Symmetry: C3
Subunit: 372 residues, 3 copies
């Protein structure tokens, strides 16, 4: 078939499946939605209650994680990295709100909310990544403990699969304890309640996009845009993903722009925006308001404008390539302004002075203060 | 299915659709042709009349452009590149005959023929490029002005898609002028008549293959071969495409060879040649004469020989990978000559002296002077 | 469809087609097998009798070759590499048992057994490699001599395809000899009997994994693991494949582990092992004994344990990515040991001391001495 990107209708998408576990919630968007198929990604949102432990798992696809809310810690068990010092374990890293974290394909990991508010992560799973060599339709997830529900469609964690004897032998451990590995008798789900706890090897593997000094774009009382790519997060050189966080203040807008190289899974973090998206046909495929917890998939090259309402509008964009670049159509550093004025007047059939105003009437860069 | 490269018949291909615009012509080859599906490319040829302005557009796929005829200028609006100095615009670059230009995915651009003869560009659109994340069947093109016809299959340029108000607001411009953006009232097509006009940021993004000093191969009264790859055109490191131009003089031939790594879209620029192509089965899939404006798709690894006729034969080869490499079967630096003579005689069941002549009777490299 | 990696059953796979030639045998596994489709590879094994010459050929896919048995020499005709000094030919390289050799896509090559025992190579053909731009279902092979049978499904070597005249002309050779090229009158098949014979340009393009000093893992009376990746075989940076050889001594085991980034085509070289493989569902998809000449496909991220029997168990793993990395679940440098003990006890619902033993009772790295 291969026509999933012939899109004339996009939708504000919300999770269509829930997975309730003892200490957390996993909400799964519908990966069958055409625009997800086009983008080749899946999105989940996990809400881990305080003292909740997301059991160790891995997925064949790389993930881009935004910590929407809360703080906690994630342990990554990267093969080959140094033990640490009783007890030994690999580097524990901290998760905080505003954090954009990169999970390389196959890397096993667990998370724990050691904070007071629920820990909330919005996870892009890039099933179409070159790194994912399993199926492209749905993420494949392998758990290392518990008896977790399938997240994307007689089952258990990978240990349940092995002959119990082999397990016991493997760990130099009793059979009875091996059965604990297999968690055949476990009903807690993928996020369990705990009490308390207590170069890739050394990098943070994250950058906090709430750090206003890191913004690439600010416009006085318009807002800011903060990019995560291969320069501030070098691992993204390997994942070939990037990300951005945007804040639009009351009635501010992001000029119509298109992303050159990447699909943009724009998740609304807070506020509300009139979002309009146009396809290659010059047809609007989207003209709706996005608010908390909704996302829209902006396909590569699809033109888009974001107009904040009175409460502003804030989003994280997961981008399906390395150093995704976009181009504003209006403003300073825009397609129009890059056009020689004669080209502008000629292509739009307007005066050299109408052209001028078309080019320069908008002095802001990318983010504008607007009236609502 | 995935059998589009099971090819037993190739065809001399010509455009199957025309798109007439006010100041230019766009001829589109049939991307459904099996060998195009196999190669994962589309080909167009644009003829821009003098004083003709190819409206700004972009496509999700990278393009390799050969300027077959004429000269003019192209403006590339690469996001982030410096303005220039009344008026400000991005770097204007010159296009001349023999130019092989690389357009990265998503980069918006316009062209203008400021010369006296029609400006003619043969464009390979590499829809199967990793850079293209939309559909693979047909190029997706987005225009920034006018009301252009679909080039590959109630429509308009991307601005037509937006709420007019939002447009006006975006540019700090009147509504009436915003409607000009949307060009709902435009009948000029994608190439309009104009009057006159007047690290990637600084590179030429082109090399002229008509520069005889750049030839990698010359053979006295046989002709020349000139390659564009990542060394003389570094951007091609990003596009993962390469190109070559070949000139065969009267009755000269390019020895049977195969390309190791890439499909070869060989477009005939001038002259005429008996071209023969063999598949993995040892079957001829092509044995016809190519002339002006026709192309054949040579699939990766398919063996091919090109025999010029009395007027010679000249072609541009667009190659679907980085630094595509080929191997001659005959001549100096050929498969046969690289074979130890005993291997040759043994595999061909011939004498050590028949073998010798098989190896050395052909002292030329790649291009030979032949009799017609 | 795209569900070939939804695997609940793997099989010990053996060749399903034989191709007998005059001086050798070619055994072809069934590339239609679901797990081959999932992995996107094909496997062949060629047995070249002493004094046997594997005719020159190339395939659009890169190959990883393990010399299971024997020694001989392979000639690679890489385009552009220096002639050598009567006779001139390209660098001849030696093949020996334990050799893991990398063949880049499209590179023409022949092999010859100049040894006394049959020369046996197990060949992974990575049809799903980015380098292969032809069909993905089956390897495409082009021969440069003889009249070889199709290896994967009115035919001949590529020369047979050309007009004989053109051939003769091409090589400056008589017609009668040109017909020898076309081998229309040849019944020897792809491996013929001979008598005797006699930066990529200069690299060995191989590393011998039988070199015990190169082992990355040894465990006293357990065995060893030896990896071939981009560091000891730099060309693999281009192929994006890796390999390993494993030897398990009597009753030794490789702890349950999963490969993070790559499918693992594990071919059994000698001995016998109880191999168990688990999918993402916690279901065993394989629990059988592998022995000489059988392979199983371990999909990326599928968990696996290998238990040698009394004769030990030795395998070569062809891996479908660059520097494939795996993670042991048990032992030193394992997922479990990388887990903070509180996470372990909490996720497995066991004591801080049961947890401890789960973590540390297994002091070996990856390879363990076990009881059978």
């Amino acid at each position: 078939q291969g026509n999933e990107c012939q899109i004339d209708r996009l939708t504000a998408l919300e999770p269509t499946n829930r997975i309730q576990a003892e200490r957390g919630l996993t909400e799964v968007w519908d990966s069958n939605e055409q625009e997800f198929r086009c983008a080749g990604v899946s999105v989940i949102r996990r809400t881990i209650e305080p003292h909740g432990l997301l059991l160790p798992s891995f997925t064949s696809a790389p993930e881009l994680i935004y910590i929407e809310q809360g703080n906690g810690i994630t342990g990554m068990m990267i093969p080959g990295c140094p033990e640490t010092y009783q007890d030994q374990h690999q580097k524990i890293r901290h998760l905080r709100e505003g954090d954009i974290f990169a999970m390389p394909a196959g890397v096993s990991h667990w998370a724990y909310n050691n904070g007071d508010q629920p820990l909330v992560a919005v996870i892009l799973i890039d099933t179409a990544n070159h790194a994912n060599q399993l199926d492209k339709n749905f993420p494949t997830r392998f758990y290392l403990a518990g008896k977790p529900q399938q997240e994307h469609s007689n089952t258990g964690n990978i240990f349940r699969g092995f002959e119990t004897r082999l397990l016991a032998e493997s760990f130099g451990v009793s059979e009875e304890i091996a059965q604990k590995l297999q968690a055949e008798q476990d009903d807690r789900g993928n996020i369990v309640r705990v009490e308390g706890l207590h170069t890739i090897c050394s990098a943070r593997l994250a950058v906090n996009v709430d750090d206003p000094s890191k913004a690439d774009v600010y416009t006085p009382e318009a807002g800011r845009l903060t990019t995560v790519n291969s320069f501030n997060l070098p691992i993204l050189r390997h994942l070939r993903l990037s990300a951005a966080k945007g804040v639009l203040y009351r009635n501010a807008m992001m000029a119509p722009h298109y992303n050159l190289n990447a699909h943009n899974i724009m998740y609304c973090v807070r506020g509300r925006g009139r979002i309009q998206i146009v396809n290659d046909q010059g047809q609007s495929v989207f003209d709706e308001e996005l608010s908390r917890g909704q996302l829209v998939v902006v396909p590569q090259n699809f033109a888009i404008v974001k107009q904040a309402f009175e409460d502003g509008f804030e989003w994280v964009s997961f981008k399906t390539s390395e150093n995704a670049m976009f181009q504003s159509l209006a403003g300073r550093t825009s397609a129009i302004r890059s056009l020689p004025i004669d080209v502008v007047s000629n292509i739009y059939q307007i005066s050299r002075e109408e052209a001028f105003g078309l080019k320069f009437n908008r002095p802001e860069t990318t983010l504008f203060r607007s009236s609502g």
